[PDB]
Amino acid sequence: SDQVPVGNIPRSITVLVEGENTRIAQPGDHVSVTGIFLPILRVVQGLLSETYLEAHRIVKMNLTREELRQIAEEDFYEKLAASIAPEIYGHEDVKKALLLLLVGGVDQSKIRGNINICLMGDPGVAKSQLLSYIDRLAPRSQYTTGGLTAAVLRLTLEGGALVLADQGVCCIDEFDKMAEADRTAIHEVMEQQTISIAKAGILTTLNARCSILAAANPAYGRYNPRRSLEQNIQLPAALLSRFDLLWLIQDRPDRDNDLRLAQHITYVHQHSRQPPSQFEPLDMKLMRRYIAMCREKQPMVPESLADYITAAYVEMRREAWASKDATYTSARTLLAILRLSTALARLRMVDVVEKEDVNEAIRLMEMSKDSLL
Amino acid sequence: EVRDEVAEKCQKLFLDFLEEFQSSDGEIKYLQLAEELIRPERNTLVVSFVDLEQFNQQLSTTIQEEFYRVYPYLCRALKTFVKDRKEIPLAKDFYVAFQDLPTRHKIRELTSSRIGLLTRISGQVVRTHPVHPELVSGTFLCLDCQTVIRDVEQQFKYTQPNICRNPVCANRRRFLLDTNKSRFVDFQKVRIQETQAELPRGSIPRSLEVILRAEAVESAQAGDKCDFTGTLIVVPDVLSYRLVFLACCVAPTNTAESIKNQMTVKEWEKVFEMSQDKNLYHNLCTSLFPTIHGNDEVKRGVLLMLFGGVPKTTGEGTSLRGDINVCIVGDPSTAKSQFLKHVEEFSPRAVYTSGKASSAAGLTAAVVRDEESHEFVIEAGALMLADNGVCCIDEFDKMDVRDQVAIHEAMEQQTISITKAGVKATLNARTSILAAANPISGHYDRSKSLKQNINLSAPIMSRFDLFFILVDECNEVTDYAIARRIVDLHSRIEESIDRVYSLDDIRRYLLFARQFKPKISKESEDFIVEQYKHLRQRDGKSSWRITVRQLESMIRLSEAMARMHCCDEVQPKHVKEAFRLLNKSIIRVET
Amino acid sequence: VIWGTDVNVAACKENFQRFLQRFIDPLYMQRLGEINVIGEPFLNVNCEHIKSFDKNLYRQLISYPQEVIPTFDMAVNEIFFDRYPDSILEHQIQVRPFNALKTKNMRNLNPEDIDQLITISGMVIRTSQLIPEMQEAFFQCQVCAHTTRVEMDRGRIAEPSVCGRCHTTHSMALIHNRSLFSDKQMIKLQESPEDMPAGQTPHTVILFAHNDLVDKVQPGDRVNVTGIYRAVPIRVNPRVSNVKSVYKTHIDVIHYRKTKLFSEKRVELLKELSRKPDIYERLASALAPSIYEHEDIKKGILLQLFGGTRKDFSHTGRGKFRAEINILLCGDPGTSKSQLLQYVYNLVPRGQYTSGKGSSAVGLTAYVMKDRQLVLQTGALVLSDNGICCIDEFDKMNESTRSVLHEVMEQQTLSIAKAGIICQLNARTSVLAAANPIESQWNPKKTTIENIQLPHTLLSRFDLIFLMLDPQDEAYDRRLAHHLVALYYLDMAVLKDYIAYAHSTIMPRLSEEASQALIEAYVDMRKIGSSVSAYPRQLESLIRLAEAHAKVRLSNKVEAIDVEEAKRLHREALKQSATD
Numbered sequence A: 001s002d003q004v005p006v007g008n009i010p011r012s013i014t015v016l017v018e019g020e021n022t023r024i025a026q027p028g029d030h031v032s033v034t035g036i037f038l039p040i041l042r043v044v045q046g047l048l049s050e051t052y053l054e055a056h057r058i059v060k061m062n063l064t065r066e067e068l069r070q071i072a073e074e075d076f077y078e079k080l081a082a083s084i085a086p087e088i089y090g091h092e093d094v095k096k097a098l099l100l101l102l103v104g105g106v107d108q109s110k111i112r113g114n115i116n117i118c119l120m121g122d123p124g125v126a127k128s129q130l131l132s133y134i135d136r137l138a139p140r141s142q143y144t145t146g147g148l149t150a151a152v153l154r155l156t157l158e159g160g161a162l163v164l165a166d167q168g169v170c171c172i173d174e175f176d177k178m179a180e181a182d183r184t185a186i187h188e189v190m191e192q193q194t195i196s197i198a199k200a201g202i203l204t205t206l207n208a209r210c211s212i213l214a215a216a217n218p219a220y221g222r223y224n225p226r227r228s229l230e231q232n233i234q235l236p237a238a239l240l241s242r243f244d245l246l247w248l249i250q251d252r253p254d255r256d257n258d259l260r261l262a263q264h265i266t267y268v269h270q271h272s273r274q275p276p277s278q279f280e281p282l283d284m285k286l287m288r289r290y291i292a293m294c295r296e297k298q299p300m301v302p303e304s305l306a307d308y309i310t311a312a313y314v315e316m317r318r319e320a321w322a323s324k325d326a327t328y329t330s331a332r333t334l335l336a337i338l339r340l341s342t343a344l345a346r347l348r349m350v351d352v353v354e355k356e357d358v359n360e361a362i363r364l365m366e367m368s369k370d371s372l373l
Numbered sequence B: 001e002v003r004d005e006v007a008e009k010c011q012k013l014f015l016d017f018l019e020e021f022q023s024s025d026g027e028i029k030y031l032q033l034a035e036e037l038i039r040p041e042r043n044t045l046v047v048s049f050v051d052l053e054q055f056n057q058q059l060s061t062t063i064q065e066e067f068y069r070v071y072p073y074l075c076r077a078l079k080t081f082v083k084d085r086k087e088i089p090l091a092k093d094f095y096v097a098f099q100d101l102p103t104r105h106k107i108r109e110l111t112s113s114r115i116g117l118l119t120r121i122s123g124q125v126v127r128t129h130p131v132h133p134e135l136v137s138g139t140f141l142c143l144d145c146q147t148v149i150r151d152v153e154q155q156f157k158y159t160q161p162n163i164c165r166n167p168v169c170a171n172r173r174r175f176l177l178d179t180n181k182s183r184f185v186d187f188q189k190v191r192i193q194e195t196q197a198e199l200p201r202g203s204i205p206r207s208l209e210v211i212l213r214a215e216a217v218e219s220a221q222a223g224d225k226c227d228f229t230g231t232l233i234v235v236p237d238v239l240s241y242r243l244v245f246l247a248c249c250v251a252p253t254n255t256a257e258s259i260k261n262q263m264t265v266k267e268w269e270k271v272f273e274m275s276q277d278k279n280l281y282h283n284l285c286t287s288l289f290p291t292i293h294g295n296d297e298v299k300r301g302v303l304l305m306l307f308g309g310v311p312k313t314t315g316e317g318t319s320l321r322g323d324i325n326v327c328i329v330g331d332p333s334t335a336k337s338q339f340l341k342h343v344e345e346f347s348p349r350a351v352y353t354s355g356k357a358s359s360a361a362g363l364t365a366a367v368v369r370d371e372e373s374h375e376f377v378i379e380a381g382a383l384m385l386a387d388n389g390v391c392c393i394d395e396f397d398k399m400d401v402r403d404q405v406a407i408h409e410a411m412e413q414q415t416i417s418i419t420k421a422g423v424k425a426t427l428n429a430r431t432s433i434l435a436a437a438n439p440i441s442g443h444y445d446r447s448k449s450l451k452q453n454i455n456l457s458a459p460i461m462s463r464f465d466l467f468f469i470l471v472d473e474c475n476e477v478t479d480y481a482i483a484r485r486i487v488d489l490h491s492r493i494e495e496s497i498d499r500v501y502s503l504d505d506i507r508r509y510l511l512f513a514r515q516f517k518p519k520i521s522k523e524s525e526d527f528i529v530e531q532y533k534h535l536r537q538r539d540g541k542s543s544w545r546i547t548v549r550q551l552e553s554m555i556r557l558s559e560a561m562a563r564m565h566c567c568d569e570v571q572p573k574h575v576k577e578a579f580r581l582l583n584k585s586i587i588r589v590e591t
Numbered sequence C: 001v002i003w004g005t006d007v008n009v010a011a012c013k014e015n016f017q018r019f020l021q022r023f024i025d026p027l028y029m030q031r032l033g034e035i036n037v038i039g040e041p042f043l044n045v046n047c048e049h050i051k052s053f054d055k056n057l058y059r060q061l062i063s064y065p066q067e068v069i070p071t072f073d074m075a076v077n078e079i080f081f082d083r084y085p086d087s088i089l090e091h092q093i094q095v096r097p098f099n100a101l102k103t104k105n106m107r108n109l110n111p112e113d114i115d116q117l118i119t120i121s122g123m124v125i126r127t128s129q130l131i132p133e134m135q136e137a138f139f140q141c142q143v144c145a146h147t148t149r150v151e152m153d154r155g156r157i158a159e160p161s162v163c164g165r166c167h168t169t170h171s172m173a174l175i176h177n178r179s180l181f182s183d184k185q186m187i188k189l190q191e192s193p194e195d196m197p198a199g200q201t202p203h204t205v206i207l208f209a210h211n212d213l214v215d216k217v218q219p220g221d222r223v224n225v226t227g228i229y230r231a232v233p234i235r236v237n238p239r240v241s242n243v244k245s246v247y248k249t250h251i252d253v254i255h256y257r258k259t260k261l262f263s264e265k266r267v268e269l270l271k272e273l274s275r276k277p278d279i280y281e282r283l284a285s286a287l288a289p290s291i292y293e294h295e296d297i298k299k300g301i302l303l304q305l306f307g308g309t310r311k312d313f314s315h316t317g318r319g320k321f322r323a324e325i326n327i328l329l330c331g332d333p334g335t336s337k338s339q340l341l342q343y344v345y346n347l348v349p350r351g352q353y354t355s356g357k358g359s360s361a362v363g364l365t366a367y368v369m370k371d372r373q374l375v376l377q378t379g380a381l382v383l384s385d386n387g388i389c390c391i392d393e394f395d396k397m398n399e400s401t402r403s404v405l406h407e408v409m410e411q412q413t414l415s416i417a418k419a420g421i422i423c424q425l426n427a428r429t430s431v432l433a434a435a436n437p438i439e440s441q442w443n444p445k446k447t448t449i450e451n452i453q454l455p456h457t458l459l460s461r462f463d464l465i466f467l468m469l470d471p472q473d474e475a476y477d478r479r480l481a482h483h484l485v486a487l488y489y490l491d492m493a494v495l496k497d498y499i500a501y502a503h504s505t506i507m508p509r510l511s512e513e514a515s516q517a518l519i520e521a522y523v524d525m526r527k528i529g530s531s532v533s534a535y536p537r538q539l540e541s542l543i544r545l546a547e548a549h550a551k552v553r554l555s556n557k558v559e560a561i562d563v564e565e566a567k568r569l570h571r572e573a574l575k576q577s578a579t580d
């Protein structure tokens, strides 16, 4: 996806592997092939033939000072959040969560490093645009609407979008309109990071380790606050509980906020650019570079911080029990807290998590649960 | 014009055998058999294989080896023999049916090496397809050269002539079928499976398709066990081929004197001692149910069901049921399924099934579309599979209303008339039914009537000979004894059973006793009358009232008890014991 | 010698005869005598015996099976005409070697193995009715009925296209019945899941059984099949003679084997660790280390892994006894139910994991589907005949699947009405079900039946119902957080080997002390219920658990300690689902 032009789609080349090179590649593998490009004749002004690539070697592949100074800035992270789709006014915390997803977990050993996020909201709140922007910014990206999972074409395995993610990010718009089988598949993806598929009674397991960014709309129109979750939406509650972060976006008519949004849109239409902000949004390439730099690190969690993390967890769980409506609190929540903290540590380029990161993760989690208010 | 010397010699020898072979009386039996065959609806003549083997061993060997090759010539010989003898219709189909074949192969043993040779197999019919005329010797006319192609035999498929008749013309693609001139024969596709006797434990049975024609078309009905004498053949299927057993003759599978003569000296001595063994009733009950404690009445009733009464058909074509039906309503656990499993395991012809079965048959005969043929076929259900046997149905309270009404009709009329999708049949089903059920809510409320305790419809309850209520007593001694039985069974893996009679001995004794048909003595008649007088006078409160249906059940149980000792006449002992059993089975409201 | 090999017919036959006569564990002569009376003309030989006796002969046999087996057949026939020189048999003896080259890495198979005898272990998935394949076609002229025969026309049949007596044009049609056929059965067999290291894509192979050995393996049977590897061309179009440059490959079976462990070191080690007084508790702790604070549930699942001793009640006439242990873990979401199910499925061999939803990729049922041959496809329950079926989301199931589960848990078999025939696939599986209560949380004061809404009979079939909840306890939350964070910043192999050894070797048997203890415990339970009382099914569960615990201790006989442990565990489960 890196080499694909912005306004085009990936192209395919058939490769004929033979000899010892066989059984050296799997679907979804980001590989490099050295071989001879030759035609296969399986007649306008000459013969016409289909081409292939006779493989010979297959190998599975895996700044300036001012840049570092900017990285050292405390607002640096916030700045990056502002750069996530600047034209999308508001949703700052949502953008921050998306950035955390983009930087991912650490998987210190192993821990599932993917940070699955879901955005449930009324129609017309920029969800699809956000998903598209993430697909454009994440180095390895897939976009889908609901195929997603692998298939057995007739006799060849064909990786679905989920497989093509393979440590990338799979942005699934219109999540609420996904087939039940697909729901089960994504459940398995979030549980083991593998896809099990069987067409002729053969359970084949493929490595699909990819963060999931889902978007959904409440059924029967806009979300009804008086109706509990899964009442305005038709998704299994457990599946939602799987996601590390679940954000509810409500298009509440607020004259002030609505006016602000209108002003923003008008400025865009009158200048083809978003209104000027405190920090100019960074170019996508630079964002990707910083993301990769963050992926370099694998910060640790000092045992001392454990005490505070446990305290926070017990506090929030007690609050949830005090809350009349169950807020999906469970060990999953603690795991997500840890993942978010380590992702923030990656953003800080510090191999040791800090109180700051834990507090920020807790704040994001609280804000999601409040968004369900 | 090529003459098969084998075929012609076989035809000559077969005609000679027909016109010379004679019975012990010195007369040609087949002459009289054919004379009987002249009548309408009689187009198949049976022939004893052993008889022709004695007449000519070489002829029998050749026919066995090449039965399919020579069969048409045998039919031609029969046609010639019958045509010149008497006033038979000048042109109607005739066939020869062979029997008395000593070699009885198993469906497992049917291999391609046996294709085309005569053989006899034994199986159980599963489903039966509608009759259908099929062209055997088609006649066509070439469109271009308008010449009539005749006798273009088809091998069970739409085989048009290879090329025109005329050497001059080579249309080869536009032959027109002459329906009137074409020769047709009525074929019925049946499916059979390995009988449970030959079925290996835990092995899927072999399903074999067979073709019935002529007199055998309607001979075999769904759900019955039959032996087919015929020849395995191949049929092309959309160079693919599949096996089908074209059966020339169909007969039912396999008297007291006959059994005793056939029975071995030691076995007959054992059975004679059994008959002369007093108190054989309780002894046999205990032997047949070792892993059980208490519930002596349930075991008594089950044994009486196993024996069965004497069926009777009135002069007005009314069938009086001879076998009895038993139901066991019990609290959770209490070994109901254990009773049914024991009955199924001990008795051949007994089939165990559950009221939760989702099979298209649904515990009775049904009509279902074949997945491939898409033609409605009468599929036999478990109840049919228990023909002249026992059907141990568990979860009887949980049966569907469809199966419930079907079973009601079956137990009422002893036959199921199934009509749907244009198909119609009347399948005989004389099957003793042993049902297991649970009280509504799980526990039996002894202060409520039986109706309030079970969801079964009134007709089903009325048509049951005996209801046995199994209440989980809180008595410490009973629970201690049950624990003793179970623990002794599990520790002493075997040898814990104390069978005064072996299972095979019990089976052979039951078969011997079945041959008897006990009659009712005038003393027995008046004793039955007086017992029913007392039962009516009781008039209570009892869970279910007492009607003439109870009197019928009483007489059937008395017949079964008479059969127990093999005595050919009823005695007051049997009647009084049956009265005791039925009266005890009645439970009064404890409110 | 035959071209391109090292094989001499006379010398090879003499060497095979020497192997038959001169050998030490003579068994071949014994089974030759057995065949005499039996008449079964198939001399099965373990190729490893030839390897030990003569490695050169074993190599020669493997390299050129098709050319060497007839020599062995001839030698065996000559011997049978030497020993018991007088006898009657429809066809002379045949030899079907086996267990020669365990290249069971079916995923790792090479074209170098073409036309070489190989043995592979796997579970047959599908079969088909025996196919009659022509070997001597018979033809008759439509004009003059000139009979003619064409014998072994290299698979296809050479149509004469011209008669031989009238010599007319092409008019001689084949007569199917007059022809000659041989039996050929097709089987589709899947690679054994256990043997695969990765198992990302389970491998499948096609087998052909010719002229014999037909229908000897039923669907779902785990067997070792030894046969000749074969590659045959596939024509692009039947009309044209062009063939694909890539051959499709199959196996021509020669022998079927329906189916010590490790070394003395492993048996010694397992015995040593068994001697530990707390081996039971230590094994429980080792199981599923990720889980925390759960002990009764872990002990129950461990006993299920070991299961009760196999018992034969055929003589008693009581039918098969369910020696397997079925455990239902009922709990609110987030109690680590699915983690335990996956861990158990990831530990026990030949285990199966499935979801109660019909959307499960495996499916808890078997059914017939068109290939377009309407052939059966097995379910998870039948698939794990002797393994453990970990059912997740067991609460959400359709009534038909509930009936199927009831049938399998009762009779240990599944009845399927294919076409019209009813087939009873034996499935003696161990059911480990997980259920999540309806509604967001579990409402107290309501029975498990009310809060799960499953049939009372079906849950009564289960021998242990373990209720697990997330307590609203700050101390428990703190402990769990500490455990998880510690996990953030005994190897299963030895446990698996211990379980395998216990299953293979030991078979607990009851004892008089154990019998009396069982009786006393049951009567005490009855008395307690005098005031959901006791049932004999509870006694069956207690005896099965006691047998399993004895198996864990390797006592080989049920002991009063086992009875006490079983009673305590059962009482704990009762308490878990108890209410009053």
Ligand SMILES: Nc1ncnc2c1ncn2[C@@H]1O[C@H](COP(=O)(O)OP(=O)(O)OP(=O)(O)O)[C@@H](O)[C@H]1O
Pocket (backbone or CB within 6 Å): A087, A088, A089, A090, A091, A122, A123, A124, A125, A126, A127, A128, A129, A174, A215, A217, A261
């Ligand atoms: N908060 C926002 N800030 C800026 N633009 C917004 C915002 N919310 C919505 N929009 C604008 O709404 C326009 C149309 O709606 P949009 O594409 O965002 O729908 P959506 O939320 O993806 O809807 P759905 O999921 O129902 O298809 C987009 O061009 C986007 O620019």
Ligand SMILES: Nc1ncnc2c1ncn2[C@@H]1O[C@H](COP(=O)(O)OP(=O)(O)OP(=O)(O)O)[C@@H](O)[C@H]1O
Pocket (backbone or CB within 6 Å): B291, B292, B293, B294, B295, B330, B331, B332, B333, B334, B335, B336, B337, B338, B438, B482, B485, B486, C457, C536, C537, C540
């Ligand atoms: N009265 C009894 N005497 C001896 N054994 C008994 C008795 N009642 C129950 N049992 C034992 O109970 C064990 C379990 O009972 P079983 O499973 O056969 O019950 P069931 O009749 O199928 O129950 P239900 O249909 O009500 O669920 C059986 O092995 C049987 O040995």
Ligand SMILES: Nc1ncnc2c1ncn2[C@@H]1O[C@H](COP(=O)(O)OP(=O)(O)OP(=O)(O)O)[C@@H](O)[C@H]1O
Pocket (backbone or CB within 6 Å): A238, A330, A331, A332, C290, C291, C292, C293, C294, C331, C332, C333, C334, C335, C336, C337, C338, C339, C340, C436, C480
């Ligand atoms: N008592 C416990 N000890 C250890 N880990 C626990 C415990 N309770 C919960 N967990 C952890 O909580 C998470 C629960 O995940 P899992 O999907 O297995 O839960 P579940 O209760 O089976 O869920 P569900 O019923 O929704 O499918 C896992 O991290 C599990 O390790």
Ligand SMILES: [Mg+2]
Pocket (backbone or CB within 6 Å): A127, A128, A129, A173
């Ligand atoms: Mg949208």
Ligand SMILES: [Mg+2]
Pocket (backbone or CB within 6 Å): B336, B337, B338, B394
């Ligand atoms: Mg039962």
Ligand SMILES: [Mg+2]
Pocket (backbone or CB within 6 Å): C336, C337, C338, C339
């Ligand atoms: Mg779970």
Ligand SMILES: [Zn+2]
Pocket (backbone or CB within 6 Å): B142, B143, B144, B145, B146, B164, B165, B166, B169, B170, B171, B172
């Ligand atoms: Zn013509």
Ligand SMILES: [Zn+2]
Pocket (backbone or CB within 6 Å): C141, C142, C143, C144, C145, C146, C163, C164, C165, C166, C167, C168
């Ligand atoms: Zn000719």
